[PDB]
Design a protein around this ligand. Structure first.
Ligand SMILES: O=c1ccn([C@@H]2O[C@H](CO)[C@@H](O)[C@H]2O)c(=O)[nH]1
Ligand SMILES: O=c1ccn([C@@H]2O[C@H](CO)[C@@H](O)[C@H]2O)c(=O)[nH]1
Ligand SMILES: O=c1ccn([C@@H]2O[C@H](CO)[C@@H](O)[C@H]2O)c(=O)[nH]1
Ligand SMILES: O=c1ccn([C@@H]2O[C@H](CO)[C@@H](O)[C@H]2O)c(=O)[nH]1
Ligand SMILES: O=c1ccn([C@@H]2O[C@H](CO)[C@@H](O)[C@H]2O)c(=O)[nH]1
Ligand SMILES: O=c1ccn([C@@H]2O[C@H](CO)[C@@H](O)[C@H]2O)c(=O)[nH]1
Ligand SMILES: O=c1ccn([C@@H]2O[C@H](CO)[C@@H](O)[C@H]2O)c(=O)[nH]1
Lengths: 73, 73, 73, 74, 73, 74, 73
């Protein structure tokens, strides 16, 4: 009787997640924190660009451009 | 005497749906939860990219970037 | 002495309509329901992509990306 | 002492207008109705795509994605 | 002790201006009216597209897509 | 104990600034005025298009499409 | 029991940060200030365009077009 998206992100704290953003951006990282707007705090994050992988470390991601968030299987 | 879009989504719970997003993204998965902004929780989700299928598993999709959702026939 | 766009959509219930969206999407389907934000419920819908036609069936379309809706003559 | 954009649209009722939208869309038709958000109802509308004309008839256009509306001189 | 953007546009009434919009649109015309949202009423307007010049005459432009407005020297 | 972005802009009045906008636009001009929404008034402005400079003069820029503002060094 | 994104940014004051924006813009600089909307004040900022570095100095970045902010490791 309530949406479970929030419960899902809470369950993802500490897990690696795949995040895709507007303008064809693809990021992977450990989800450490997030808010109701889907703004995210990732650690050990990395960008995947045309097969290249660039480690970034800590990353704050604005929710407005997030397409989806998926815990890596 | 009321729009039936929400009713359609409720009826799609547990069914596979095709979801297209901004920037030509195409995703398929089992609809498990959603809210009034069309934010979605999908299970057994996959992206269709250039004819290939990438399995992702659990996926939270932001409604703001959703173009359409269609239960797979 | 009032805009007649809503009356036009009401009159299009049950008719086939052409809908184009942001990012060059073109869809055709039977309009079954809609709301004041132009969110739409289509049945027997199909996507037209580069000459290809993909049948989808039931489709919920977010009005925010809708460019136009035109009852098929 | 007030903007006249609204009066211009009122004056275009019944006239053909050229309308361009986001993502390079170009449409023409007779303006039959409009609101303050620039949502439009066109009759005898047609899309101009790569120099070719596609007749659509009645068309509801969302103002959110309109760039400009220009009554056709004629 | 106040922003002077509004004053500038007021001073441009009756002048020819260059207006550039989202998606690479470039327009020239005489500014006849405007509002606080930068919506514009132009007369004797023309579009400049890849070297082509198409005369349009009267044009109502939505401020939301305006990039800049520059009265022509 | 407060953001200093507005103070930076205030300090930029009279200086030439580089402004880049959505859709790859690059502009330069003297910052003369601005508001809390980052709408800008530029004088002696110019666009840089494909390496070439096009002088425009006075220009009103909408903050919504602004990516960044940077006073030109030296 | 609260999101830690804001605290991450506070901790990054005086640090080198990598910032990516809409339309494929990539910027590097020292974070000097910021607000709740992710508008940023950067110093010794530079743009990375096609693999080359363009030094810009002081830069105010609008949060609305920011994709992510990542403190350089
Ligand atoms: O698209 C999304 C993804 C996640 N959530 C989270 O799920 C809860 C829904 O009420 C919120 O706390 C929020 O953090 C949303 O609301 N929307
Ligand atoms: O595009 C859509 C899909 C669904 N709904 C339904 O309408 C309510 C909108 O807030 C929600 O509860 C949802 O079920 C919409 O309005 N728009
Ligand atoms: O694009 C549209 C279509 C319809 N409506 C309104 O929604 C109602 C639908 O019956 C009408 O009264 C009409 O004013 C809009 O505001 N915008
Ligand atoms: O871009 C435009 C075009 C027209 N109007 C007119 O101004 C009024 C604003 O509420 C409406 O009645 C409408 O006709 C605008 O405000 N903005
Ligand atoms: O950057 C801008 C552009 C326009 N305006 C509004 O547009 C009108 C321009 O003369 C003014 O009344 C003002 O309210 C602004 O506030 N900021
Ligand atoms: O991007 C910006 C620029 C300025 N300001 C604030 O808005 C006021 C404009 O005069 C200033 O005091 C400043 O703190 C912002 O919030 N964001
Ligand atoms: O993405 C972000 C980054 C920071 N903040 C908050 O906005 C304030 C800016 O000073 C901080 O206290 C911080 O908690 C957010 O809400 N979202």
């Amino acid at each position: 009787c309530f949406a479970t998206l929030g419960a899902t992100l809470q369950d993802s704290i500490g897990k690696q997640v795949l995040v895709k953003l507007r303008d064809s951006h693809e990021i992977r990282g450990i989800l450490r924190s997030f808010d109701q707007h889907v703004n995210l705090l990732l650690e050990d994050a990395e960008e995947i660009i045309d097969g290249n992988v660039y480690k970034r470390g800590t990353m704050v991601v604005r929710g407005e451009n997030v397409l989806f968030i998926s815990p890596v299987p």
